[PDB]
Amino acid sequence: SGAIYVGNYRVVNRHLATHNDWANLVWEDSSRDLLVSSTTAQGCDTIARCDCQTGVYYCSSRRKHYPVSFSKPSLIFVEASEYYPARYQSHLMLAVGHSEPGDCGGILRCQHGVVGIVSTGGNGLVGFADVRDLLWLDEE
C-alpha cells in the first residue's frame, strides 16, 4: 500500500483505490494502474520533472529503501494476477529489486522528487508506474 500526496491530490495504484477514492475521483487509467482522488488537506510530496534513470524506492516487504537503476517509461507485458488480465501496461519502468503484491504503492524518488509508485515485479523485478508526465498534479 502507499500513495503520493501532492497539493490536493492523492495518487494511488488503481487496483488499491478505496470507495472514498472513487467517490472523490479526479482521473484514472487502467492501462497505467493509476488513480488520482482529491483531498481536503494539502500534501508534502513534490513531483520530479526529469529523465533520471537512477533513484531510490521503498520496499515494505523489507522495511528498506533500495537504490536502483530503472528503464525509461515504456509499454511492458505484465502477467496475469488477480488484479489484471494479460496485457501491456503503459508508462511502466522496470528495475532489479525484490518486490511482493503488497509492495505496490511504495515511492520511487530521484534527486528532483517523486518519480512514481511500485506497480509490478517478479523474481527480482519491480516495476514502477511513472507520474512525471502528469504535469497537472502541480496545479489547482
Residues that bind ligand A1B3E (CB under 6 A): 15, 33, 78, 81, 83-84, 89, 99-101, 103-104, 118-122, 126
Q: How near is the Cβ of 110 to ligand A1B3E at its closest, in Å?
A: 19
Annotated binding site for Zn(2+): 50, 52, 110, 112
Active site residue 21: no
Q: Are 127 and 121 in contact (CB under 8 A)?
A: yes
Catalytic residue among 21, 33, 103, 130, which? Answer: 33
Query: Residue 132 and residue 68: Cα distance in Å, rounded?
Result: 17
Q: How near is the Cβ of 22 to Zn ion at its closest, in Å?
A: 31
Going along 14-112, which residue ranges are E strands?
25-29, 34-38, 54-59, 64-69, 74-78, 87-95, 107-110
Query: Residue 138 and residue 92: Cα distance in Å, rounded?
Result: 21
Active site residue 33: yes
Active site residue 104: yes
